[PDB]
Amino acid sequence: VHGHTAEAAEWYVPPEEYPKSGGVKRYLIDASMVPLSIMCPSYDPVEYTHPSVAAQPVWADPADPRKIKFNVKDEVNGKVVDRTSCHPSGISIDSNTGRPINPWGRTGMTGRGLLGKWGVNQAADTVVTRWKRSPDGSILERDGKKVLEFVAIQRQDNKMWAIPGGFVDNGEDVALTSGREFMEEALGMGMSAESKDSLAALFSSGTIVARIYCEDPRNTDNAWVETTCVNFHDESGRHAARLKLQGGDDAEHARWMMVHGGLNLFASHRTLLQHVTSALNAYF
Amino acid sequence: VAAKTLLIENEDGKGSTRMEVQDFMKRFHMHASEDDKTGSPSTAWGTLRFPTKEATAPYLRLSVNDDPEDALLFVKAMLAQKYGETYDRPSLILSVTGGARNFTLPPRLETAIAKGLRLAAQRTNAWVVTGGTNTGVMKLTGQIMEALSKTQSHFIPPTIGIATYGVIIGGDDMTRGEPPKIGLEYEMHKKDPPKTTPLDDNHNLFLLVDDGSTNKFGKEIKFRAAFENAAGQAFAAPVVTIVVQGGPGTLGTALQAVRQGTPIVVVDGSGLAADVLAYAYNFMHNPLTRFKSYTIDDLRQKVAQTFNPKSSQQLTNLLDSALECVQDPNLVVVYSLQESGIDEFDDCILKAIFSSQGKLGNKLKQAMYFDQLDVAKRALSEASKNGQHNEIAACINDNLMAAMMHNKPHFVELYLGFDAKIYELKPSEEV
Amino acid sequence: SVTGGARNFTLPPRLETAIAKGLRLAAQRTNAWVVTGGTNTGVMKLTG
Amino acid sequence: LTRFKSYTIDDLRQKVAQTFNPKSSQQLTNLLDSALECVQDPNLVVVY
Amino acid sequence: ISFRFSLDQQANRLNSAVA
Ligand SMILES: Nc1ncnc2c1ncn2[C@@H]1O[C@H](COP(=O)(O)O)[C@@H](O)[C@H]1O
Ligand SMILES: O=P(O)(O)OC[C@H]1O[C@@H](O)[C@H](O)[C@@H]1O
Ligand SMILES: [Mg+2]
Ligand SMILES: [Mg+2]
């Protein structure tokens, strides 16, 4: 009908203006030149580092990446950090400068961006879901499938709606990160006696649905975000109904949002929601 | 005889002071050309007499940079002059938006909109704010309020028309002269080049927003929104927007309305953007079986066949905006003939009132105006169960007082039954 | 035997009317002895 | 009935905790146990 | 409504309570 239109697998190309860099622009590349298997000799990326990252906080790796081991769990200052990439080939280390090389393609920008750790920045996202129900108690049904509903926060930095989540701190696991990020972002201040135990009841059953590479605009050639997605589903809906949603920390507003395929969310969160609906045979 | 003094309401909201007409009206400005920014004082204000209409409608040409509170004071001063100081204050602001171009609606649907809008307007003494021009939904709204101006005596609810000055036929005739123009004849069929848009003869008051441009649309939305918000804060009354048919800009207008917390009532079955909004709301929220086959793909197909965008990104943006409008189910109320009923449009308006942000006592007063006891019973029972007993006791006296005043005996019996002592009544004013 | 709250409380009018109608009929039809706490507060005062 | 099919002992415990507000968990457990012991025989309890 | 309820109920484990 069409005639072999709209490629084969449309790759990811980050936007031209780097976020929060004061107008610093990357080196623009076409989507058929992005992968690392392809040679692409006309490639001159720009090296840019944020002043916040260059000021050396606690969550930032050192500026000289020598002696650091990638693709394995590495101990920095006695705290475990998981530098394992979800890419099957793994992460390759450049011999000239010691910087890691992104296996998921070119992003038109070298150096360490807004991300504090060289290589894989492991992020954890928390998708707290419940079935979308009418006042009568009947489950809403669209396209012959049951309809989901998830907690979404409006980000402070770019005012786009997104799934709550954040970078894994040093010496902590994905469990703590997921719970801590949900209480900090979606809930703000944190939980009333049994209501808190009820939330614990909500938090006792989580399934890792995906561990994928993020289409995050802050990604560079030497620092990229890879996410582990944890779904907390409330089958009965009792625990979900006791949550008092109120935006805190780096989130402006938080709300319950119906899950569908036309959602315009930050980074690759639509893929994460697709994985959640694929696992629970829900509408998407 | 031309008026020389006006009763302008104080900023404290306690009484009206008498001041000279030239002193009050000096604060409104007009722009002679687009280049001009500061402007000059408005020489275009007075009253227009339309053919086959007994009463005259006041008009004020004011700039885009002018304060909407001042325009609100002007409308209050006109009403205070015509109906006395103790005129019926509005408990509802009805903003009517939609299609600029002419359209034809089904007779049953038109009858339903007319019946619901007339009852709502007569029960709440509502201010109806439209575009003011003699085409489409504004002309249609004028036809619904014409019967109100014919069938009812004493107080007539205002039909304020806020329009851009650069497209209006007869602007030069209104501008030239010595203000006020008492009973000026308006010739809607006269060719004032390049204007081809006449003013609706059934609107009771006109605010002509001027920015110096000619034959440019869309200049009055922000001032209109600011005026509605200012009126809503001043009379402590909720603002309800009603969306009938509408084009692409109506979607952005509705988006602005739902972003600012103002509830909307979308008339389903009127076609175009209203059908798109109704389809989107029914897809996202309605639990009935006939909406289970609704899909986002069919919604995209409907938007593409109806609006016909040039680019896919435009279609994506319109679809995204439409889905963003109906995110909060409380702020959108969809009226449909096959679901609600012919005499259920005022119930939809009351549903929008109850879904808005306001105090319960005020909501009970609105429920008392529309004569919906069951709604009041359900609200009181829900408030009683949820531990909100203090607000019930704080507002029961004023609600009982309002019930005695507006001749609602069932409501009198209901408020007296919930432990409200008859001999503990207090007057609204201080003796 | 009527038991319940010592402290004062307010009931809904429909519910109060229902309790009053049922209790009055039961009492007049069976010549019943109503035993309460006797004090002038709450359910005892209400029963009174 | 269908509207009581969503009733659970956890929500009952939550209702007792929000209403009576016990100092200790054992007190809440004892009150819940006593409440469940009251309505064991369906003939002896009539709910209006 | 009883049938509606019946037909409704007819149609990497991780514990994050430590947070
Ligand atoms: N590897 C990390 N990379 C970037 N930010 C981190 C990292 N670890 C912790 N953070 C903190 O998490 C915050 C989340 O980003 P933001 O939305 O800008 O507040 C950052 O601003 C840092 O304070
Ligand atoms: O640390 P913040 O900025 O709060 O959130 C990190 C986000 O960056 C994205 O890749 C993740 O999906 C995650 O949602
Ligand atoms: Mg976050
Ligand atoms: Mg964060």
Determine the Cα angle at B347 with ends B418 and B140, to 5°.
Answer: 145
For B153, residues 6+ apart whose C-beta sits below 8 A from its C-beta are none
How far does the CA of residue B417 sit from the closest CA of chain C (Å)?
A: 7
C-alpha closest to that of B140 among B168, B106, B171: B106
The amino acid occupying position A201 is: A
At residue B317, φ and ψ (nearest 5 deg) are -65, -40
How far is the centre of ligand 2, averaged over its atoms, from the C-alpha of A123 (Å)? 6
Find out whether B239 and B95 touch, Cβ atoms under 8 Å.
yes
Encode B291-328: b = buried (16+ Cβ within 10 Å), e = exposed.
Answer: bbebebeebbeebeeebebeeeeebeebbebbbbbbbe
Q: Does B418 touch chain C (CB under 8 A)?
A: yes
**Residue position matching structure tokens 């001009």:** B36
For ligand 2, whether the C-beta of A163 sits within 6 Å is yes
Encode A211-250: b = buried (16+ Cβ within 10 Å), e = exposed.
Answer: bebbbbbbbbbbbbbbbbbbbbbbeeebbbebbeeebbbe
C-alpha closest to that of A52 among A78, A27, A28, A22: A22
Query: What is the DSSP pairing of strand A79-82 with strand A73-76?
Result: antiparallel
Cα separation of B417 and A165, whole Å? 52
Cα separation of B69 and B53, whole Å? 29
Cα separation of E11 and A141, whole Å? 11
Give Cα B360 to chain centroid, integer Å: 22
- The ligand minimizing its distance to the Cα of A52 is 1
Query: Which mutation among A50, A114, A167, A252 tests ligand 1's pocket best, with the greatest number of atoms within 8 A of CB?
Result: A167
Encode A4-36: b = buried (16+ Cβ within 10 Å), e = exposed.
Answer: eeeeeeeeebbeeebeebeeeebeebeeebbeb
Query: Tokens representing B163?
Result: 């329009």
Q: How many CB atoms lie within 10 A of CB B275?
A: 19
Between the alpha carbon of residue D6 and those of residues B33, C46, D10, the distances in Å are 69, 34, 11
For ligand 1, whether the C-beta of A113 sits within 6 Å is no
For B288, residues 6+ apart whose C-beta sits below 8 A from its C-beta are none
Cα separation of B415 and B392, whole Å? 10
Helices (H), chain D: 9-20, 25-38
Query: What is the DSSP pairing of strand A223-234 with strand A206-213?
Result: antiparallel
Question: Which H or E run includes A207?
Answer: strand A206-213
Q: Where are the beta strands (DSSP E) in chain E?
A: 13-14
Between the alpha carbon of residue B168 and those of residues B180, B221, B249, the distances in Å are 19, 16, 20
The amino acid occupying position A258 is: M
Method: cryo-EM
Find out whether A101 and A92 touch, Cβ atoms under 8 Å.
yes
Give Cα B396 to chain centroid, integer Å: 29
At residue B2, φ and ψ (nearest 5 deg) are -65, 140
Q: Does A133 touch chain E (CB under 8 A)?
A: no
Looking at chain C, the number of H-run helices and the number of E-run strands are 2, 0
Encode B401-428: b = buried (16+ Cβ within 10 Å), e = exposed.
Answer: bbbeeeebeebbebbeebebeeeeeeee
Query: Tokens representing B245?
Result: 């048919």
The amino acid occupying position A151 is: V
For ligand 1, whether the C-beta of A252 sits within 6 Å is no
Collapsing DSSP to helix, strand or coil, B161 comes out as: strand
Which residues on neighbouring strands pair with residue A229, listed in sequence order? A125, A210
For ligand 2, whether the C-beta of A169 sits within 6 Å is no
C-alpha closest to that of A131 among A148, A145, A144: A148
Determine which residue's CA is closest to atom 2 belonging to ligand 1: A116
Q: Kindly list the residues of chain A whose beta carbon comes within 8 Å of any beta carbon in chain B.
A: 134, 136, 138, 140-144, 255, 257-258, 260-262, 264
Query: Tokens representing B13?
Result: 């909201």
Helix, strand and coil content of chain B, in percent to the nearest 5, comes to 45, 15, 40
Cα separation of A273 and B190, whole Å? 60
For D41, residues 6+ apart whose C-beta sits below 8 A from its C-beta are none
Determine the Cα angle at B120 with ends B329 and B381, to 5°.
Answer: 55
The amino acid occupying position A108 is: G
Q: Which residue of D has its CA nearest to E4?
A: D2
At residue B218, φ and ψ (nearest 5 deg) are 80, 10
Cα separation of B189 and B192, whole Å? 9
Cα separation of A94 and A221, whole Å? 11
Query: Tokens representing B186?
Result: 């308006």
**Residue position matching structure tokens 């201040």:** A189
C-alpha closest to that of B182 among B39, B32, B335, B2: B2
Angle, helices B312-325 vs B296-307, to 10°: value is 120
